[PDB]
């Protein structure tokens, strides 16, 4: 099994593009930009798409234009259209459980209260896809979480997130080939 599709989770709109909830979108935006590739609007698939070369592999980059909580509508339509199985999908998302600068890999598991992930599990009928978890840190109490993810990181956090994005890009050939050693934090 190898990765054919990378979903970058986020909310569409200028007011959301800089927020912590959009770091998945930033990840795919950086891949596209590194490759001199633009996204195309695909309203019938509920997303923006770009196809890029990653050395000797290709992937479809997907930014759902649905808003976070209906991301699965886009992922499901795109997977159906390109004939891609859930195991061949990488979903990149903000992760509260690790700090800005940190990045982990995880196959499957529950949504952990993430609406983007819950929606994808619902539309696919399975949670068994690959996840790239980009740390945004945690505000310290659950009651502050919504506002936290809908806010911009500090200058120092943004720099740390950008670095963690670079780190995931450096591990991308391995990620695409399901070589998932816990070897990101040794970088
Ligand atoms: Cl943090």
mmCIF file with all atom_site columns, C-alpha atoms and ligand atoms in Angstrom:
data_model
loop_
_atom_site.group_PDB
_atom_site.id
_atom_site.type_symbol
_atom_site.label_atom_id
_atom_site.label_alt_id
_atom_site.label_comp_id
_atom_site.label_asym_id
_atom_site.label_entity_id
_atom_site.label_seq_id
_atom_site.pdbx_PDB_ins_code
_atom_site.Cartn_x
_atom_site.Cartn_y
_atom_site.Cartn_z
_atom_site.occupancy
_atom_site.B_iso_or_equiv
_atom_site.pdbx_formal_charge
_atom_site.auth_seq_id
_atom_site.auth_comp_id
_atom_site.auth_asym_id
_atom_site.auth_atom_id
_atom_site.pdbx_PDB_model_num
ATOM   1   C  CA  . UNK A 1 1   ? 0.000   0.000  0.000  1.00 0.00 ? 1   UNK A CA  1
ATOM   2   C  CA  . UNK A 1 2   ? 1.265   3.497  -0.943 1.00 0.00 ? 2   UNK A CA  1
ATOM   3   C  CA  . UNK A 1 3   ? -0.081  7.047  -0.611 1.00 0.00 ? 3   UNK A CA  1
ATOM   4   C  CA  . UNK A 1 4   ? -1.777  8.455  -3.713 1.00 0.00 ? 4   UNK A CA  1
ATOM   5   C  CA  . UNK A 1 5   ? -3.705  11.343 -2.179 1.00 0.00 ? 5   UNK A CA  1
ATOM   6   C  CA  . UNK A 1 6   ? -2.826  13.986 0.436  1.00 0.00 ? 6   UNK A CA  1
ATOM   7   C  CA  . UNK A 1 7   ? -5.666  15.885 2.141  1.00 0.00 ? 7   UNK A CA  1
ATOM   8   C  CA  . UNK A 1 8   ? -4.781  19.193 3.808  1.00 0.00 ? 8   UNK A CA  1
ATOM   9   C  CA  . UNK A 1 9   ? -7.486  20.068 6.334  1.00 0.00 ? 9   UNK A CA  1
ATOM   10  C  CA  . UNK A 1 10  ? -8.677  23.624 6.906  1.00 0.00 ? 10  UNK A CA  1
ATOM   11  C  CA  . UNK A 1 11  ? -11.379 26.245 6.480  1.00 0.00 ? 11  UNK A CA  1
ATOM   12  C  CA  . UNK A 1 12  ? -11.622 28.188 3.211  1.00 0.00 ? 12  UNK A CA  1
ATOM   13  C  CA  . UNK A 1 13  ? -11.513 32.046 3.438  1.00 0.00 ? 13  UNK A CA  1
ATOM   14  C  CA  . UNK A 1 14  ? -8.871  34.727 4.215  1.00 0.00 ? 14  UNK A CA  1
ATOM   15  C  CA  . UNK A 1 15  ? -10.055 34.989 7.839  1.00 0.00 ? 15  UNK A CA  1
ATOM   16  C  CA  . UNK A 1 16  ? -9.187  31.312 8.422  1.00 0.00 ? 16  UNK A CA  1
ATOM   17  C  CA  . UNK A 1 17  ? -6.084  30.800 6.290  1.00 0.00 ? 17  UNK A CA  1
ATOM   18  C  CA  . UNK A 1 18  ? -3.655  31.857 9.079  1.00 0.00 ? 18  UNK A CA  1
ATOM   19  C  CA  . UNK A 1 19  ? -5.382  29.888 11.912 1.00 0.00 ? 19  UNK A CA  1
ATOM   20  C  CA  . UNK A 1 20  ? -4.051  26.781 13.737 1.00 0.00 ? 20  UNK A CA  1
ATOM   21  C  CA  . UNK A 1 21  ? -6.932  24.655 12.407 1.00 0.00 ? 21  UNK A CA  1
ATOM   22  C  CA  . UNK A 1 22  ? -5.480  25.190 8.863  1.00 0.00 ? 22  UNK A CA  1
ATOM   23  C  CA  . UNK A 1 23  ? -1.938  23.772 9.292  1.00 0.00 ? 23  UNK A CA  1
ATOM   24  C  CA  . UNK A 1 24  ? -2.860  20.726 7.132  1.00 0.00 ? 24  UNK A CA  1
ATOM   25  C  CA  . UNK A 1 25  ? -3.696  23.105 4.272  1.00 0.00 ? 25  UNK A CA  1
ATOM   26  C  CA  . UNK A 1 26  ? -0.343  24.849 4.839  1.00 0.00 ? 26  UNK A CA  1
ATOM   27  C  CA  . UNK A 1 27  ? 1.469   21.502 4.494  1.00 0.00 ? 27  UNK A CA  1
ATOM   28  C  CA  . UNK A 1 28  ? -0.001  20.789 1.017  1.00 0.00 ? 28  UNK A CA  1
ATOM   29  C  CA  . UNK A 1 29  ? 0.390   24.478 0.035  1.00 0.00 ? 29  UNK A CA  1
ATOM   30  C  CA  . UNK A 1 30  ? 4.117   24.203 0.737  1.00 0.00 ? 30  UNK A CA  1
ATOM   31  C  CA  . UNK A 1 31  ? 4.415   20.999 -1.383 1.00 0.00 ? 31  UNK A CA  1
ATOM   32  C  CA  . UNK A 1 32  ? 2.584   22.681 -4.282 1.00 0.00 ? 32  UNK A CA  1
ATOM   33  C  CA  . UNK A 1 33  ? 4.740   25.831 -3.986 1.00 0.00 ? 33  UNK A CA  1
ATOM   34  C  CA  . UNK A 1 34  ? 8.037   23.838 -3.756 1.00 0.00 ? 34  UNK A CA  1
ATOM   35  C  CA  . UNK A 1 35  ? 6.992   22.215 -7.066 1.00 0.00 ? 35  UNK A CA  1
ATOM   36  C  CA  . UNK A 1 36  ? 5.815   25.387 -8.917 1.00 0.00 ? 36  UNK A CA  1
ATOM   37  C  CA  . UNK A 1 37  ? 2.293   23.870 -9.072 1.00 0.00 ? 37  UNK A CA  1
ATOM   38  C  CA  . UNK A 1 38  ? -1.028  25.671 -8.624 1.00 0.00 ? 38  UNK A CA  1
ATOM   39  C  CA  . UNK A 1 39  ? -4.324  24.373 -7.219 1.00 0.00 ? 39  UNK A CA  1
ATOM   40  C  CA  . UNK A 1 40  ? -7.479  24.266 -9.379 1.00 0.00 ? 40  UNK A CA  1
ATOM   41  C  CA  . UNK A 1 41  ? -11.001 24.895 -8.128 1.00 0.00 ? 41  UNK A CA  1
ATOM   42  C  CA  . UNK A 1 42  ? -13.118 21.709 -8.374 1.00 0.00 ? 42  UNK A CA  1
ATOM   43  C  CA  . UNK A 1 43  ? -16.583 22.641 -6.959 1.00 0.00 ? 43  UNK A CA  1
ATOM   44  C  CA  . UNK A 1 44  ? -18.134 19.351 -8.206 1.00 0.00 ? 44  UNK A CA  1
ATOM   45  C  CA  . UNK A 1 45  ? -15.611 17.525 -5.987 1.00 0.00 ? 45  UNK A CA  1
ATOM   46  C  CA  . UNK A 1 46  ? -16.014 20.126 -3.182 1.00 0.00 ? 46  UNK A CA  1
ATOM   47  C  CA  . UNK A 1 47  ? -12.314 21.016 -3.189 1.00 0.00 ? 47  UNK A CA  1
ATOM   48  C  CA  . UNK A 1 48  ? -9.221  22.523 -4.743 1.00 0.00 ? 48  UNK A CA  1
ATOM   49  C  CA  . UNK A 1 49  ? -6.867  20.037 -6.426 1.00 0.00 ? 49  UNK A CA  1
ATOM   50  C  CA  . UNK A 1 50  ? -3.209  19.903 -7.458 1.00 0.00 ? 50  UNK A CA  1
ATOM   51  C  CA  . UNK A 1 51  ? -1.194  16.961 -8.793 1.00 0.00 ? 51  UNK A CA  1
ATOM   52  C  CA  . UNK A 1 52  ? 2.516   16.967 -7.936 1.00 0.00 ? 52  UNK A CA  1
ATOM   53  C  CA  . UNK A 1 53  ? 5.644   14.846 -8.401 1.00 0.00 ? 53  UNK A CA  1
ATOM   54  C  CA  . UNK A 1 54  ? 7.369   13.675 -5.237 1.00 0.00 ? 54  UNK A CA  1
ATOM   55  C  CA  . UNK A 1 55  ? 10.548  12.178 -6.678 1.00 0.00 ? 55  UNK A CA  1
ATOM   56  C  CA  . UNK A 1 56  ? 9.445   8.903  -8.317 1.00 0.00 ? 56  UNK A CA  1
ATOM   57  C  CA  . UNK A 1 57  ? 5.883   9.019  -6.915 1.00 0.00 ? 57  UNK A CA  1
ATOM   58  C  CA  . UNK A 1 58  ? 2.894   11.245 -7.774 1.00 0.00 ? 58  UNK A CA  1
ATOM   59  C  CA  . UNK A 1 59  ? 0.108   12.421 -5.495 1.00 0.00 ? 59  UNK A CA  1
ATOM   60  C  CA  . UNK A 1 60  ? -3.131  14.396 -5.699 1.00 0.00 ? 60  UNK A CA  1
ATOM   61  C  CA  . UNK A 1 61  ? -3.164  17.275 -3.199 1.00 0.00 ? 61  UNK A CA  1
ATOM   62  C  CA  . UNK A 1 62  ? -6.658  18.067 -1.877 1.00 0.00 ? 62  UNK A CA  1
ATOM   63  C  CA  . UNK A 1 63  ? -7.961  21.102 0.021  1.00 0.00 ? 63  UNK A CA  1
ATOM   64  C  CA  . UNK A 1 64  ? -11.669 20.606 0.876  1.00 0.00 ? 64  UNK A CA  1
ATOM   65  C  CA  . UNK A 1 65  ? -13.672 23.840 0.356  1.00 0.00 ? 65  UNK A CA  1
ATOM   66  C  CA  . UNK A 1 66  ? -16.500 22.482 2.567  1.00 0.00 ? 66  UNK A CA  1
ATOM   67  C  CA  . UNK A 1 67  ? -15.398 23.908 5.896  1.00 0.00 ? 67  UNK A CA  1
ATOM   68  C  CA  . UNK A 1 68  ? -13.810 21.603 8.434  1.00 0.00 ? 68  UNK A CA  1
ATOM   69  C  CA  . UNK A 1 69  ? -16.881 19.705 9.646  1.00 0.00 ? 69  UNK A CA  1
ATOM   70  C  CA  . UNK A 1 70  ? -17.847 18.428 6.179  1.00 0.00 ? 70  UNK A CA  1
ATOM   71  C  CA  . UNK A 1 71  ? -14.329 17.623 4.864  1.00 0.00 ? 71  UNK A CA  1
ATOM   72  C  CA  . UNK A 1 72  ? -15.386 13.967 4.287  1.00 0.00 ? 72  UNK A CA  1
ATOM   73  C  CA  . UNK A 1 73  ? -17.774 15.026 1.479  1.00 0.00 ? 73  UNK A CA  1
ATOM   74  C  CA  . UNK A 1 74  ? -14.728 16.286 -0.499 1.00 0.00 ? 74  UNK A CA  1
ATOM   75  C  CA  . UNK A 1 75  ? -12.358 13.397 0.435  1.00 0.00 ? 75  UNK A CA  1
ATOM   76  C  CA  . UNK A 1 76  ? -15.080 10.825 -0.472 1.00 0.00 ? 76  UNK A CA  1
ATOM   77  C  CA  . UNK A 1 77  ? -15.939 12.407 -3.860 1.00 0.00 ? 77  UNK A CA  1
ATOM   78  C  CA  . UNK A 1 78  ? -12.238 12.770 -4.803 1.00 0.00 ? 78  UNK A CA  1
ATOM   79  C  CA  . UNK A 1 79  ? -11.381 9.179  -3.749 1.00 0.00 ? 79  UNK A CA  1
ATOM   80  C  CA  . UNK A 1 80  ? -14.345 7.906  -5.811 1.00 0.00 ? 80  UNK A CA  1
ATOM   81  C  CA  . UNK A 1 81  ? -13.360 9.996  -8.846 1.00 0.00 ? 81  UNK A CA  1
ATOM   82  C  CA  . UNK A 1 82  ? -9.650  8.978  -8.842 1.00 0.00 ? 82  UNK A CA  1
ATOM   83  C  CA  . UNK A 1 83  ? -10.410 5.423  -7.662 1.00 0.00 ? 83  UNK A CA  1
ATOM   84  C  CA  . UNK A 1 84  ? -8.300  5.667  -4.487 1.00 0.00 ? 84  UNK A CA  1
ATOM   85  C  CA  . UNK A 1 85  ? -8.710  3.354  -1.462 1.00 0.00 ? 85  UNK A CA  1
ATOM   86  C  CA  . UNK A 1 86  ? -8.784  4.667  2.136  1.00 0.00 ? 86  UNK A CA  1
ATOM   87  C  CA  . UNK A 1 87  ? -5.314  3.091  2.838  1.00 0.00 ? 87  UNK A CA  1
ATOM   88  C  CA  . UNK A 1 88  ? -3.876  5.221  -0.005 1.00 0.00 ? 88  UNK A CA  1
ATOM   89  C  CA  . UNK A 1 89  ? -4.999  8.494  1.640  1.00 0.00 ? 89  UNK A CA  1
ATOM   90  C  CA  . UNK A 1 90  ? -2.861  10.693 3.858  1.00 0.00 ? 90  UNK A CA  1
ATOM   91  C  CA  . UNK A 1 91  ? -4.773  13.200 5.993  1.00 0.00 ? 91  UNK A CA  1
ATOM   92  C  CA  . UNK A 1 92  ? -2.751  16.135 7.365  1.00 0.00 ? 92  UNK A CA  1
ATOM   93  C  CA  . UNK A 1 93  ? -4.239  17.972 10.346 1.00 0.00 ? 93  UNK A CA  1
ATOM   94  C  CA  . UNK A 1 94  ? -3.664  20.121 13.416 1.00 0.00 ? 94  UNK A CA  1
ATOM   95  C  CA  . UNK A 1 95  ? -2.839  18.120 16.556 1.00 0.00 ? 95  UNK A CA  1
ATOM   96  C  CA  . UNK A 1 96  ? -3.472  19.540 20.055 1.00 0.00 ? 96  UNK A CA  1
ATOM   97  C  CA  . UNK A 1 97  ? -1.664  16.657 21.834 1.00 0.00 ? 97  UNK A CA  1
ATOM   98  C  CA  . UNK A 1 98  ? 1.791   17.692 20.607 1.00 0.00 ? 98  UNK A CA  1
ATOM   99  C  CA  . UNK A 1 99  ? 3.502   21.081 20.543 1.00 0.00 ? 99  UNK A CA  1
ATOM   100 C  CA  . UNK A 1 100 ? 4.245   23.473 17.709 1.00 0.00 ? 100 UNK A CA  1
ATOM   101 C  CA  . UNK A 1 101 ? 7.441   22.224 16.027 1.00 0.00 ? 101 UNK A CA  1
ATOM   102 C  CA  . UNK A 1 102 ? 6.423   18.609 16.516 1.00 0.00 ? 102 UNK A CA  1
ATOM   103 C  CA  . UNK A 1 103 ? 5.036   16.276 13.863 1.00 0.00 ? 103 UNK A CA  1
ATOM   104 C  CA  . UNK A 1 104 ? 3.913   12.604 14.227 1.00 0.00 ? 104 UNK A CA  1
ATOM   105 C  CA  . UNK A 1 105 ? 2.625   9.870  11.919 1.00 0.00 ? 105 UNK A CA  1
ATOM   106 C  CA  . UNK A 1 106 ? -0.388  7.600  12.814 1.00 0.00 ? 106 UNK A CA  1
ATOM   107 C  CA  . UNK A 1 107 ? -2.310  4.930  10.858 1.00 0.00 ? 107 UNK A CA  1
ATOM   108 C  CA  . UNK A 1 108 ? -6.027  4.819  11.809 1.00 0.00 ? 108 UNK A CA  1
ATOM   109 C  CA  . UNK A 1 109 ? -7.567  5.429  15.229 1.00 0.00 ? 109 UNK A CA  1
ATOM   110 C  CA  . UNK A 1 110 ? -10.581 7.540  16.211 1.00 0.00 ? 110 UNK A CA  1
ATOM   111 C  CA  . UNK A 1 111 ? -11.163 11.192 15.406 1.00 0.00 ? 111 UNK A CA  1
ATOM   112 C  CA  . UNK A 1 112 ? -10.233 12.343 18.964 1.00 0.00 ? 112 UNK A CA  1
ATOM   113 C  CA  . UNK A 1 113 ? -12.875 15.120 18.801 1.00 0.00 ? 113 UNK A CA  1
ATOM   114 C  CA  . UNK A 1 114 ? -11.503 16.536 15.469 1.00 0.00 ? 114 UNK A CA  1
ATOM   115 C  CA  . UNK A 1 115 ? -14.517 17.432 13.224 1.00 0.00 ? 115 UNK A CA  1
ATOM   116 C  CA  . UNK A 1 116 ? -12.458 17.154 10.015 1.00 0.00 ? 116 UNK A CA  1
ATOM   117 C  CA  . UNK A 1 117 ? -11.416 13.611 10.967 1.00 0.00 ? 117 UNK A CA  1
ATOM   118 C  CA  . UNK A 1 118 ? -14.915 12.660 12.213 1.00 0.00 ? 118 UNK A CA  1
ATOM   119 C  CA  . UNK A 1 119 ? -16.445 13.776 8.878  1.00 0.00 ? 119 UNK A CA  1
ATOM   120 C  CA  . UNK A 1 120 ? -13.868 11.790 6.865  1.00 0.00 ? 120 UNK A CA  1
ATOM   121 C  CA  . UNK A 1 121 ? -14.500 8.619  8.956  1.00 0.00 ? 121 UNK A CA  1
ATOM   122 C  CA  . UNK A 1 122 ? -18.228 9.075  8.305  1.00 0.00 ? 122 UNK A CA  1
ATOM   123 C  CA  . UNK A 1 123 ? -18.035 9.563  4.513  1.00 0.00 ? 123 UNK A CA  1
ATOM   124 C  CA  . UNK A 1 124 ? -15.362 6.871  3.959  1.00 0.00 ? 124 UNK A CA  1
ATOM   125 C  CA  . UNK A 1 125 ? -17.059 4.347  6.293  1.00 0.00 ? 125 UNK A CA  1
ATOM   126 C  CA  . UNK A 1 126 ? -13.678 3.683  7.926  1.00 0.00 ? 126 UNK A CA  1
ATOM   127 C  CA  . UNK A 1 127 ? -10.974 5.507  9.916  1.00 0.00 ? 127 UNK A CA  1
ATOM   128 C  CA  . UNK A 1 128 ? -8.196  3.346  8.418  1.00 0.00 ? 128 UNK A CA  1
ATOM   129 C  CA  . UNK A 1 129 ? -6.262  6.022  6.535  1.00 0.00 ? 129 UNK A CA  1
ATOM   130 C  CA  . UNK A 1 130 ? -2.844  7.529  7.263  1.00 0.00 ? 130 UNK A CA  1
ATOM   131 C  CA  . UNK A 1 131 ? -2.599  10.710 9.361  1.00 0.00 ? 131 UNK A CA  1
ATOM   132 C  CA  . UNK A 1 132 ? 0.178   13.287 9.585  1.00 0.00 ? 132 UNK A CA  1
ATOM   133 C  CA  . UNK A 1 133 ? -0.324  15.087 12.866 1.00 0.00 ? 133 UNK A CA  1
ATOM   134 C  CA  . UNK A 1 134 ? 1.084   18.621 12.950 1.00 0.00 ? 134 UNK A CA  1
ATOM   135 C  CA  . UNK A 1 135 ? 1.458   19.932 16.539 1.00 0.00 ? 135 UNK A CA  1
ATOM   136 C  CA  . UNK A 1 136 ? -0.207  23.241 17.371 1.00 0.00 ? 136 UNK A CA  1
ATOM   137 C  CA  . UNK A 1 137 ? 0.022   22.745 21.134 1.00 0.00 ? 137 UNK A CA  1
ATOM   138 C  CA  . UNK A 1 138 ? -2.828  22.865 23.621 1.00 0.00 ? 138 UNK A CA  1
ATOM   139 C  CA  . UNK A 1 139 ? -4.289  25.989 25.382 1.00 0.00 ? 139 UNK A CA  1
ATOM   140 C  CA  . UNK A 1 140 ? -4.321  24.219 28.772 1.00 0.00 ? 140 UNK A CA  1
ATOM   141 C  CA  . UNK A 1 141 ? -8.038  23.612 29.322 1.00 0.00 ? 141 UNK A CA  1
ATOM   142 C  CA  . UNK A 1 142 ? -10.584 21.897 27.026 1.00 0.00 ? 142 UNK A CA  1
ATOM   143 C  CA  . UNK A 1 143 ? -12.968 24.898 27.301 1.00 0.00 ? 143 UNK A CA  1
ATOM   144 C  CA  . UNK A 1 144 ? -10.400 27.104 25.421 1.00 0.00 ? 144 UNK A CA  1
ATOM   145 C  CA  . UNK A 1 145 ? -9.781  24.641 22.541 1.00 0.00 ? 145 UNK A CA  1
ATOM   146 C  CA  . UNK A 1 146 ? -12.298 25.970 19.951 1.00 0.00 ? 146 UNK A CA  1
ATOM   147 C  CA  . UNK A 1 147 ? -11.052 29.551 20.142 1.00 0.00 ? 147 UNK A CA  1
ATOM   148 C  CA  . UNK A 1 148 ? -7.442  28.245 20.239 1.00 0.00 ? 148 UNK A CA  1
ATOM   149 C  CA  . UNK A 1 149 ? -7.686  26.354 16.908 1.00 0.00 ? 149 UNK A CA  1
ATOM   150 C  CA  . UNK A 1 150 ? -9.622  29.256 15.375 1.00 0.00 ? 150 UNK A CA  1
ATOM   151 C  CA  . UNK A 1 151 ? -6.754  31.621 16.274 1.00 0.00 ? 151 UNK A CA  1
ATOM   152 C  CA  . UNK A 1 152 ? -3.390  32.428 14.721 1.00 0.00 ? 152 UNK A CA  1
ATOM   153 C  CA  . UNK A 1 153 ? -0.302  30.930 16.312 1.00 0.00 ? 153 UNK A CA  1
ATOM   154 C  CA  . UNK A 1 154 ? 2.178   33.332 17.880 1.00 0.00 ? 154 UNK A CA  1
ATOM   155 C  CA  . UNK A 1 155 ? 5.205   34.380 15.806 1.00 0.00 ? 155 UNK A CA  1
ATOM   156 C  CA  . UNK A 1 156 ? 7.367   31.742 17.576 1.00 0.00 ? 156 UNK A CA  1
ATOM   157 C  CA  . UNK A 1 157 ? 4.752   28.986 17.127 1.00 0.00 ? 157 UNK A CA  1
ATOM   158 C  CA  . UNK A 1 158 ? 4.298   29.837 13.357 1.00 0.00 ? 158 UNK A CA  1
ATOM   159 C  CA  . UNK A 1 159 ? 8.093   29.499 12.920 1.00 0.00 ? 159 UNK A CA  1
ATOM   160 C  CA  . UNK A 1 160 ? 7.973   26.150 14.805 1.00 0.00 ? 160 UNK A CA  1
ATOM   161 C  CA  . UNK A 1 161 ? 5.023   24.874 12.734 1.00 0.00 ? 161 UNK A CA  1
ATOM   162 C  CA  . UNK A 1 162 ? 6.819   25.909 9.476  1.00 0.00 ? 162 UNK A CA  1
ATOM   163 C  CA  . UNK A 1 163 ? 9.852   23.958 10.653 1.00 0.00 ? 163 UNK A CA  1
ATOM   164 C  CA  . UNK A 1 164 ? 7.695   20.885 11.489 1.00 0.00 ? 164 UNK A CA  1
ATOM   165 C  CA  . UNK A 1 165 ? 6.178   21.205 7.997  1.00 0.00 ? 165 UNK A CA  1
ATOM   166 C  CA  . UNK A 1 166 ? 9.712   21.162 6.509  1.00 0.00 ? 166 UNK A CA  1
ATOM   167 C  CA  . UNK A 1 167 ? 10.483  18.065 8.612  1.00 0.00 ? 167 UNK A CA  1
ATOM   168 C  CA  . UNK A 1 168 ? 7.413   16.163 7.237  1.00 0.00 ? 168 UNK A CA  1
ATOM   169 C  CA  . UNK A 1 169 ? 8.390   17.183 3.683  1.00 0.00 ? 169 UNK A CA  1
ATOM   170 C  CA  . UNK A 1 170 ? 11.868  15.676 4.316  1.00 0.00 ? 170 UNK A CA  1
ATOM   171 C  CA  . UNK A 1 171 ? 10.206  12.365 5.429  1.00 0.00 ? 171 UNK A CA  1
ATOM   172 C  CA  . UNK A 1 172 ? 7.623   12.375 2.588  1.00 0.00 ? 172 UNK A CA  1
ATOM   173 C  CA  . UNK A 1 173 ? 9.150   9.631  0.405  1.00 0.00 ? 173 UNK A CA  1
ATOM   174 C  CA  . UNK A 1 174 ? 9.106   7.324  3.429  1.00 0.00 ? 174 UNK A CA  1
ATOM   175 C  CA  . UNK A 1 175 ? 5.591   8.434  4.445  1.00 0.00 ? 175 UNK A CA  1
ATOM   176 C  CA  . UNK A 1 176 ? 4.268   7.700  0.910  1.00 0.00 ? 176 UNK A CA  1
ATOM   177 C  CA  . UNK A 1 177 ? 5.877   4.199  1.138  1.00 0.00 ? 177 UNK A CA  1
ATOM   178 C  CA  . UNK A 1 178 ? 4.411   3.362  4.568  1.00 0.00 ? 178 UNK A CA  1
ATOM   179 C  CA  . UNK A 1 179 ? 7.823   3.283  6.263  1.00 0.00 ? 179 UNK A CA  1
ATOM   180 C  CA  . UNK A 1 180 ? 6.482   4.774  9.495  1.00 0.00 ? 180 UNK A CA  1
ATOM   181 C  CA  . UNK A 1 181 ? 9.394   4.574  11.977 1.00 0.00 ? 181 UNK A CA  1
ATOM   182 C  CA  . UNK A 1 182 ? 9.035   6.973  14.984 1.00 0.00 ? 182 UNK A CA  1
ATOM   183 C  CA  . UNK A 1 183 ? 12.036  8.680  13.531 1.00 0.00 ? 183 UNK A CA  1
ATOM   184 C  CA  . UNK A 1 184 ? 10.580  12.178 12.925 1.00 0.00 ? 184 UNK A CA  1
ATOM   185 C  CA  . UNK A 1 185 ? 11.571  13.424 16.410 1.00 0.00 ? 185 UNK A CA  1
ATOM   186 C  CA  . UNK A 1 186 ? 15.214  12.425 15.752 1.00 0.00 ? 186 UNK A CA  1
ATOM   187 C  CA  . UNK A 1 187 ? 15.499  14.923 12.894 1.00 0.00 ? 187 UNK A CA  1
HETATM 188 CL CL1 . LIG B 2 .   ? 2.945   25.027 21.056 1.00 0.00 ? 1   LIG B CL1 1
#
